[PDB]
Design a protein around this ligand. Structure first.
Ligand SMILES: Cn1cc(-c2n[nH]c3ccc(NC(=O)c4ccc(NC(=O)Nc5cc(C(F)(F)F)ccc5F)cc4C(F)(F)F)cc23)cn1
Ligand SMILES: [Cl-]
Length: 299
């Protein structure tokens, strides 16, 4: 009865405007959705239209909508429900106007100037305060999921979305975008591993736990303070496996203060149980995010 878990939207309430993205299993549109939120006769949504591989796409669709409905929470991608009346099957999401956090970081990097400012974000490179706010929110999402004993397995800035006001939410695009093909190592039967985000016990023993998500988060932090650089960008995939398995650590970013770099290092303890808790990591980044300018100045 996945049917009964998920919210449903009338097809006539959705008006497609133009495509946002396209993959093997469907197209994503920006759309107007009517009579979805009480005080909005009309709001923008992102709609995924399922390109069908028949019984398996239908089942994965229902499983994914059920899961997303269960996990709804402040720093998780907001899912509004499905449209199963006719084909194509549609999934309806909140529209996140800045797109994915990796792209957002790269367009506010250390070269940005006055032009890169906007309604939402100052010109130039994101400042320490905004970098920390981004990190705090993503870690909050991972506290919630760890609270539910849910393991992500592909936590990365490319899988987080940034909305108006720099609200950041975690999602899972499911290895679907050509621009991030480089972030995955292709093994048997087009299996894709995001090795650069994986801890040693994942690479060596094929284990991924909540503690492997805290290591992945540490790489997310590094991505954030490098403005979206790929971890181990100077290395091939196999060199990256060698460096990770043999204990090599990502270098402190220029924009990263030593206190935040200590948070990353705590995520990258070699033995999973020696890693800090994500709750503790979140608490430290929140404390820093909320700190007065006097304090942040001297970091
Ligand atoms: C400028 N711009 C704005 C946007 C934009 N705004 N909002 C958007 C919503 C979707 C997409 N695109 C996607 O592909 C897309 C992205 C994510 C999801 N599902 C997903 O995360 N599931 C999920 C999450 C979790 C976790 F992480 F929560 F624990 C655990 C398990 C899970 F299964 C599905 C799609 C799908 F559409 F394929 F369905 C783009 C936009 C695009 N460009
Ligand atoms: Cl992807």
């Amino acid at each position: 009865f996945s049917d009964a878990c998920v919210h449903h939207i009338k097809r006539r309430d959705i008006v497609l405007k133009w495509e946002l993205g396209e993959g093997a299993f469907g197209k994503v549109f920006l759309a107007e959705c009517h009579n979805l939120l009480p005080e909005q006769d009309k709001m923008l949504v992102a709609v995924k239209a399922l390109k069908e591989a028949s019984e398996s796409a239908r089942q994965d669709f229902q499983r994914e909508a059920e899961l997303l409905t269960m996990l709804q929470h402040q720093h998780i991608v907001r899912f509004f429900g499905v449209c199963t009346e006719g084909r194509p099957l549609l999934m309806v999401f909140e529209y996140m106007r800045h797109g994915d956090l990796n792209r957002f970081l790269r367009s506010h990097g250390p070269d940005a100037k006055l032009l890169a400012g906007g309604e939402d974000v100052a010109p130039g490179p994101l400042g320490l305060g905004q970098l920390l706010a981004v990190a705090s929110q993503v870690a909050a999402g991972m506290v919630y999921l760890a609270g539910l004993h849910f393991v992500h397995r592909d936590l990365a800035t490319r899988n987080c979305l940034v909305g108006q006001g720099l609200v950041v939410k975690i999602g899972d695009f499911g290895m679907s975008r050509d621009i991030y093909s480089t972030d995955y190592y292709r093994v048997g039967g087009r299996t894709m591993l995001p090795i650069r985000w994986m801890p040693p016990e994942s690479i060596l023993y094929r284990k991924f736990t909540t503690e492997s998500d805290v290591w992945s988060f540490g790489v997310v932090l590094w991505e954030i303070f490098t403005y979206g650089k790929q971890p181990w960008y100077q290395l091939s995939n196999t060199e990256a496996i060698d460096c990770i398995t043999q204990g090599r650590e990502l270098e402190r970013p220029r924009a990263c203060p030593p206190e935040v770099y200590a948070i990353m290092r705590g995520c990258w303890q070699r033995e999973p149980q020696q890693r800090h808790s994500i709750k503790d990591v979140h608490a430290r980044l929140q404390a820093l995010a909320q700190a007065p300018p006097v304090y942040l100045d001297v970091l």
